[PDB]
Amino acid sequence: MATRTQFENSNEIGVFSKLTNTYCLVAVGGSENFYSAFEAELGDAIPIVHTTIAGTRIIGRMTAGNRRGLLVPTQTTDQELQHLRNSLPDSVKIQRVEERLSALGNVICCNDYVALVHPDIDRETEELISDVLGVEVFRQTISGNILVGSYCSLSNQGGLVHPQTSVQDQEELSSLLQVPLVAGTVNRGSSVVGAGMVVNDYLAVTGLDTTAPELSVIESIFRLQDAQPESISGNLRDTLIETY
């Protein structure tokens, strides 16, 4: 279920990590506390790989992938690609992408079935993403936010968007993604939901600054806790009204 975790002293879990339904990536910065924090929830069930992208700890924003495959920017060295492939099973596709944009994690927000991309993403990159991830691709922006990969979080169970998302925009995007969406905040009101936390079909990790109401909202929307597929969110309505 939802678990609170922090980097060295940063609450942006998604910046320094990328968690999928079959593999997880963490930065090599400082120590293994982040690696041990991820292990405490996933253990040895799925591979956990220490890897860097372009010699930086921001691999989470630089890379985007799902259970079917992983995508890395052109700036990634061949050594990092080989290490990632060897640390990952052959069932996970890995391929480099060549385009003007490089922040794949911020440019692409996707799950195992549907993917959102930057409106200006080129045709070749869109086709490559579709082929690699086996997911539908749609040109969309979250209530005018062009960085779909940073201001939104998506998973097969549900998705989360920044609070400024209009109700009509939320309704349209939920129907397009075929998953429920809720407007909320992470890391004590931080608007970058896609960078402040990572989530999959069975695990969610967020910054320590995430207040109890935010954690409960995340649990309800992403359907982590048993017998809580947003059902308990109805009870959270009164709590949100009192707090808001």
């Binding site: 080989q82 480099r96 003007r100 944009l101």
Partner: protein, 100 residues
């Protein structure tokens, strides 16, 4: 190690040598030495410079298309790095050098 072919003269750009230029369009251009960078600053056309490999390619010198040149494709596939495959790749490179 990702030794690059010079954007101007296609010559190898070893680590610690040359300058890299990043355009507002996110286009990365690597210049092996000051000559190529300064020529690019002056917007000189490499295809019209007799000392640039790009000009020679179109001029019919140092044939641009050959079977051997297909082995040097900048692949994006992370091959599983098999030791036997590694040795075969070294042998293939050694043979391809002589063939080319």
């Amino acid at each position: 190690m990702r030794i690059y072919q010079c954007h101007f003269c296609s010559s190898p750009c070893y680590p610690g040598h040359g300058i890299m230029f990043v355009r507002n369009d996110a286009k990365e251009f690597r210049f092996c030495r000051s000559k190529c960078h300064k020529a690019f600053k002056q917007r000189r056309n490499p295809r019209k410079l007799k000392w640039t490999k790009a000009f020679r390619k179109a001029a019919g010198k140092e044939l641009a298309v050959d079977s051997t040149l297909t082995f040097a494709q900048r692949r994006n596939v992370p091959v599983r790095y098999n030791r036997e495959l590694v040795a075969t790749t070294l042998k293939a490179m050694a043979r391809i050098e002589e063939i080319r």
